Amino acid sequence: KRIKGSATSILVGKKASIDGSTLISRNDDGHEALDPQRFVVVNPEDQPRDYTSVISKVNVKLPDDPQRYTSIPNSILTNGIWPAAGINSSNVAMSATETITTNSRVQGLDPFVENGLGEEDLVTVVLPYVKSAREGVKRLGSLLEEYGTYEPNGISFADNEEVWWLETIGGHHWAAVRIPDDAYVVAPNRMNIDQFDFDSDDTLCSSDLKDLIDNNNLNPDFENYNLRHIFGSASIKDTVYNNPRTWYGQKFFSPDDTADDPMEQDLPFICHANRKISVEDVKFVLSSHFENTKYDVYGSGSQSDKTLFRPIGINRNHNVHILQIRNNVPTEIAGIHWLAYGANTFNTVVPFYANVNDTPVQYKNATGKFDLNNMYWLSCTTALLGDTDYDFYVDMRNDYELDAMSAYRKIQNDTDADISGQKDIEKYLENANKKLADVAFEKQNKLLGDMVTTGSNNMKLRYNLND
């Protein structure tokens, strides 16, 4: 068999955010709980021109003018690079992938292509070569049509104006929708695009998609086109593995527009929140485990209720990224690659400037060797200890989140404030990223220390005299 990713994604249009930025985000989850991640800038000279994948052995000849981009490659390259997500020098963001679903009727017509492209590959072969989110969508579509794919995937694109979501369909087909400026999306591992207008300028797809549907009796609905009804799933597994994640996110942002059934199969794709959305909001949902419901594994529910649903924050979060393209700041500091590692319950995303040529050591240097000086291993260790007694550690966790995010914001604010006239912008921003990573490590380390100190007093292996 082939190794597969898992994920939860959240998208925010430029009018829906609290600061007028676009946000595309994803929990990059995997099969094993731990799989070391690195934060790496791929400079143009480092980018392949003759690309061959490890998993599928697909060979793609690439353009000769790649742009510099951030990425989050695996430390261990057994299954290839797995760059996950990044922002290029044109301030275009891309995250790939959100594994989605398919069905036997479309697979019968356009099967997966064994030697096609996969999540292993997509950012590497698309992001360096596009100058808008729309261009990203179109290039990826072209590559799917030409080379095919062996996975069902959802991919996000953004620039300072637009946010797009592309879903792959069978071995070669695809469709994509531009998320409205004022909207957000929460997307689990299930095909998401619903109502789809072939006549809209805000949609793109395989030229033959409508004919594929119309000519092969793929449409289950009496009227109109709902792509996930046609090409996706509405399974019993969806009701426990996927829909509750969508539901919990929509309950958080749109409480008065969202009913009380986490199993709902027709939750809207495009949503409108009752307020503007912050980075902190996005990280909360990306770290969640159905808090204040009977489905919280750390909560008061029955054993069966507590384990019924797949949470969003999860032991096998490998990285979490929130890619932000800001507006009303100079373009050279618009791109922010927010990043953290390990189960999202005990980390914080750090707002790294994407306009840099290299990355901080604590985030760049993970290998297969356990190293608590590295933020991947330190963050995972913290979350594991936290998992053993969540209610005991959660107050320290909460304090740390506020304290750390406050410190990051102060550094960002100071750095933004002095951008004008900097003679070496990349060096200036690399220094800012170094400060951010240093503080992130210090506060992560201090949190773990506080947890170890208090936790040790509460060990089972104890016997105290109460005097």
Residues of this chain that bind its own copies (CB under 8 A): 18-20, 102-105, 107-109, 111, 217-222, 229, 235-237, 239, 263, 275-278, 280, 291-292, 300, 302, 304-305, 308, 394-395, 398, 402, 405-406, 408-410, 412-413
Partner whose footprint covers residue 20, from its own copies, Co ion, none (CB < 5 to 8 Å by kind): its own copies
Of 132 and 160, nearer to its own copies (C-beta) is: 160
Of 222 and 463, nearer to Co ion (C-beta) is: 222
Q: Cα–Cα distance between 41 and 465 in angstroms, integer? A: 56
Q: Which stretch binds Co ion (CB under 5 A): 59-67, 117-125, 286-294, 354-362?
A: 59-67
Provide φ and ψ at 78, rounded to 5°. -50, -35
Distance in angstroms between the alpha carbons of the first and the last residue of the chain: 61
Q: Cα–Cα distance between 370 and 307 in angstroms, integer? A: 30
Are the beta carbons of 294 and 58 closer than 8 angstroms?
Answer: no
Q: In the complex, what is the shortest distance from the CB of residue 202 to Co ion, in angstroms, rounded to a whole number? A: 11
Where does 393-463 show beta strands of DSSP type E?
none
Q: In the complex, what is the shortest distance from the CB of residue 289 to its own copies, in angstroms, rounded to a whole number? A: 10
Which pair of structure tokens corresponds to residue 130? 């596009």
Binding string, 143-182, against Co ion, x = CB under 5 A?
-------------------------------------x-x
Partner whose footprint covers residue 395, from Co ion, its own copies, none (CB < 5 to 8 Å by kind): its own copies
The number of beta carbons lying within 10 Å of the beta carbon of residue 423 is 6
Of 417 and 465, nearer to its own copies (C-beta) is: 417
**Residue listed under structure tokens 């898992």:** 6
* DSSP assigned state of 189: S
Q: In the complex, what is the shortest distance from the CB of residue 185 to its own copies, in angstroms, rounded to a whole number? A: 19
Total residues binding Co ion (CB under 5 A):
3
Of 64 and 223, nearer to its own copies (C-beta) is: 223
Within its chain, how far is the Cα of 225 from the centroid? 28
The answer to whether 66 contacts Co ion (rule: CB under 5 A) is: no
Which one of 32, 45, 50, 64 is in contact with Co ion (CB under 5 A)?
Answer: 64
Partner whose footprint covers residue 327, from its own copies, Co ion, none (CB < 5 to 8 Å by kind): none
Provide φ and ψ at 49, rounded to 5°. -105, -25
Q: Is the peptide bond before 348 cis (omega within 30 degrees of 0)?
A: no
Residue 57: left if φ>0, alpha if ψ -120 to 50, beta else—which one? left
Q: Cα–Cα distance between 309 and 302 in angstroms, integer? A: 12
Q: In the complex, what is the shortest distance from the CB of residue 220 to its own copies, in angstroms, rounded to a whole number? A: 5
Partner whose footprint covers residue 64, from its own copies, Co ion, none (CB < 5 to 8 Å by kind): Co ion
Which of 4, 105, 13 lies closest to 327 in space, CA to CA? 13
Provide CB contacts within 8 A for 253, sequence distance 6+: 184, 186, 271, 273, 274, 275, 277, 281, 285
Q: In the complex, what is the shortest distance from the CB of residue 347 to its own copies, in angstroms, rounded to a whole number? A: 15
Are the beta carbons of 69 and 89 closer than 8 angstroms?
Answer: yes
Which whole-number Å values give the CA distances from 294 to 171, 298, 303, in the listed order? 39, 9, 10
Of 51 and 298, nearer to its own copies (C-beta) is: 298
Residue-level length of the chain: 467
- AA letter at 42: V
Of 52 and 300, nearer to Co ion (C-beta) is: 52
Of 68 and 283, nearer to its own copies (C-beta) is: 283
Provide CB contacts within 8 A for 165, sequence distance 6+: 11, 154, 155, 156, 157, 176, 177, 179, 185, 187, 192, 193
Of 65 and 274, nearer to its own copies (C-beta) is: 274
- AA letter at 164: W
Q: Which stretch binds Co ion (CB under 5 A): 60-68, 157-165, 319-327, 384-392?
A: 60-68
Q: In the complex, what is the shortest distance from the CB of residue 388 to Co ion, in angstroms, rounded to a whole number? A: 44
Partner whose footprint covers residue 417, from its own copies, Co ion, none (CB < 5 to 8 Å by kind): none
Which whole-number Å values give the CA distances from 276 to 14, 290, 437, in the listed order? 10, 22, 28
Of 31 and 49, nearer to Co ion (C-beta) is: 49
Which of 5, 7, 2, 23 lies closest to 277 in space, CA to CA? 23
Which pair of structure tokens corresponds to residue 6? 């898992």
Q: In the complex, what is the shortest distance from the CB of residue 24 to its own copies, in angstroms, rounded to a whole number? A: 19
Q: In the complex, what is the shortest distance from the CB of residue 180 to Co ion, in angstroms, rounded to a whole number? A: 4
182-221 residues near Co ion, rule: CB under 5 A: 182
Q: In the complex, what is the shortest distance from the CB of residue 257 to its own copies, in angstroms, rounded to a whole number? A: 15
Partner whose footprint covers residue 180, from Co ion, its own copies, none (CB < 5 to 8 Å by kind): Co ion
Partner whose footprint covers residue 105, from Co ion, its own copies, none (CB < 5 to 8 Å by kind): its own copies
Q: In the complex, what is the shortest distance from the CB of residue 407 to its own copies, in angstroms, rounded to a whole number? A: 8
Binding positions for Co ion, rule: CB under 5 A:
64, 180, 182
